[PDB]
């Protein structure tokens, strides 16, 4: 139909007038052009404005799997990555959720508390008498959670240091705890246990 061209000439008049593109999109919604057509128009709407992310965020608000794919692109290309933190957390593959968030903190960070619960609360529960004497005698006669805990402890304050250390212990981070402690009784005894299990008898 003819009516699109009336917006196209208007785009040729003044292409950086965002309200023109918005009204053009609105008409294509009201008539109901296909998803693959409206994608081409939204990508034009972005490409004429490739220096600013806000129009990408409107596009994502319409593309809402392709919205996750383009969101991975927009995270590769930081407030929108902060807006992505709830979606990214649900992926559970910790490198993919955490790397974009730490990049956004590098180019700032608001994920620093949700991901901490992703260590002690989310990851840790799943990643964690005469029998003991028998096991000891048998011995005598013969780490994503850890990384998450280390990341949390990298910028943790002094009050949460003990909690971070405890989380490291629950992550079976014997080597990490042994290294960090080399720099409360429970923390000292946890470092003891890391040394004892790692087989560092002379230091133990």
């Amino acid at each position: 139909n003819d009516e699109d061209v009336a917006f196209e000439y208007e785009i040729q008049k003044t292409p950086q007038n965002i309200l023109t593109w918005k009204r053009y999109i609105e008409y294509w919604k009201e008539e109901g052009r296909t998803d693959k057509q409206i994608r081409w128009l939204y990508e034009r709407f972005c490409s004429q404005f490739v220096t600013d992310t806000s129009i990408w965020e409107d596009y994502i608000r319409w593309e809402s799997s392709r919205i996750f794919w383009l969101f991975q692109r927009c995270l590769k290309s930081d407030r929108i990555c902060l807006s992505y933190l709830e979606l990214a957390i649900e992926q559970y593959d910790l490198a993919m959720i955490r790397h974009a968030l730490a990049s956004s903190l590098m180019k700032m960070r608001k994920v620093w508390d949700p991901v901490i619960k992703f260590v002690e609360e989310k990851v840790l529960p799943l990643t964690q008498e005469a029998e003991l004497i028998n096991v000891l005698l048998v011995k005598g006669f013969t780490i994503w959670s850890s990384h998450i805990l280390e990341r949390y402890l990298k910028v943790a304050p002094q009050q949460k240091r003990n909690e971070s250390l405890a989380t490291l212990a629950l992550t079976r981070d014997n080597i990490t705890i042994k290294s960090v402690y080399e720099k409360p009784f429970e923390l000292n005894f946890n470092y003891l246990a890391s040394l004892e299990k790692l087989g560092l008898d002379n230091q133990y």
Binding site: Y9, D93, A95, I143
Partner: peptide, 28 residues
């Protein structure tokens, strides 16, 4: 980056324009 890659941690973490139509509108 969110730290640096290491294999023991990686394995556990993984096992968890206007010109697009402007000229056409100049002849159509």
């Amino acid at each position: 980056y969110h730290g640096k890659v290491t294999a023991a941690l990686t394995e556990f973490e993984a096992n968890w324009t206007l010109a697009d139509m402007e000229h056409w509108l100049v002849q159509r």
